[PDB]
Curated annotation (Swiss-Prot), chains A, B:
GO molecular function annotation: dihydrofolate reductase activity; dihydrofolic acid binding; folic acid binding; methotrexate binding; NADP binding; NADP+ binding; NADPH binding
Species the sequence originates in: Escherichia coli (strain K12)
Effect on the protein of changing W30G: In strain: 1810
The protein's name in its UniProt record: Dihydrofolate reductase
Enzyme class: oxidoreductase
Reaction(s) this enzyme catalyzes, per UniProt: (6S)-5,6,7,8-tetrahydrofolate + NADP(+) = 7,8-dihydrofolate + NADPH + H(+)
Misc: The strain K12 sequence is shown.
Upper taxonomic lineage: Bacteria, Pseudomonadati, Pseudomonadota, Gammaproteobacteria, Enterobacterales
Outcome of swapping C152S: Increases catalytic rate 1.5-fold. Increases catalytic rate about 7-fold
Database matches in PANTHER family: DIHYDROFOLATE REDUCTASE
Domain DHFR: start-end pairs: 1-158
Cellular component terms (Gene Ontology): cytosol
Length: 159, 159
């Protein structure tokens, strides 16, 4: 099955021109926890943002342009991205916007981190029909000595 | 010689307890470069925000309450903090607010990272009359895919 995992600010903002204005090691831990040992599909811009291949995961980059790193797998279509995954129970799509748009229709589960940050976004998570999804887990946390904003982890399954 | 190093948002706002809303790996690299191989003195809130002893530095915590961890030095007064440093060319004071207020009078140098972020806060870096201080170095950088805001490194010497 295909799952999307994303971090959304208020109004579903997922990306800005520069790095997101937050420091959330607890949120990165949740991201690592839920992606470890699984193939991750990302767009070129997200790849460039990360800076390195994510350890212990099969990194697949969906881009029309040519591969620049021998450490990851470069694919040119959704179809191709899927095939590169092989026989695994769950494929994680980690963004950005266009990538999420292309995979949403095929997605059965969403892992969302809602952060209480009001920012002017460049890209946004595609509108999802709350009537189509069931929240099976939610957990709120305040900002603390290490995390700059309050956030809530949520997992939804398509009805 | 005593030096203070701090990261200031607009209006000289500095962290109090919760982590500051920015992601500036380039700024942390500057902090690391300037404090490695020297003793660092911090207050309890900063210690909690760091979450571990900074490697390659002698970590001293100035606090009235008992020290939990055996990996660092717990002191109860300025005098003791200083003594704990031994005889080194430069002691780095890394905050927070009360700590800065206590050492400023004795400081000979300021390493400041000014960040273009408007953050609402109670705490401010102590007032310094840059007329009693000579700006000796200043280098501005724009935000990028990895750093959330623009920042400017500045070093001042007490005249
Ligand atoms: C910019 N970016 C994209 C990013 C960030 N957080 C997200 N968070 C969620 N929930 N979903 C995403 N798709 C997501 N994507 C990044 C940047 C760094 C790391 C990262 O360093 N991850 C390490 C964990 C952090 C660490 O070791 O410092 C990992 O092993 O996953 C991950 C994603
Ligand atoms: C919360 N905090 C206090 C902090 C942060 N930036 C500052 N920046 C400046 N200029 N001045 C300070 N006093 C300052 N203090 C921190 C938190 C983490 C690390 C830290 O991880 N430092 C690693 C570098 C980054 C890394 O390895 O992840 C180091 O070796 O210094 C430092 C300071
Ligand atoms: Ca439910
Ligand atoms: Cl992307
Ligand atoms: Cl402190």
């Amino acid at each position: 099955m295909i799952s999307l995992i994303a971090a959304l600010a208020v109004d579903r903002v997922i990306g800005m021109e520069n790095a997101m204005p937050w420091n959330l090691p607890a949120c990165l831990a949740w991201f690592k926890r839920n992606t470890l040992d699984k193939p991750v599909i990302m767009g070129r811009h997200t790849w460039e943002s990360i800076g390195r291949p994510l350890p212990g995961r099969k990194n697949i980059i969906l881009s029309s342009q040519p591969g620049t790193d021998d450490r990851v797998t470069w694919v040119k279509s959704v179809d191709e991205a899927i095939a590169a995954c092989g026989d695994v129970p769950e494929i994680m799509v980690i963004g950005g916007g266009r990538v999420y748009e292309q995979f949403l229709p095929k997605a059965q589960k969403l892992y969302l981190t809602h952060i209480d940050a009001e920012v002017e976004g460049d890209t946004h998570f595609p509108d999802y029909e709350p009537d189509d999804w069931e929240s099976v887990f939610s957990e709120f946390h305040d900002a603390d000595a290490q995390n700059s904003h309050s956030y809530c982890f949520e997992i939804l399954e398509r009805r």
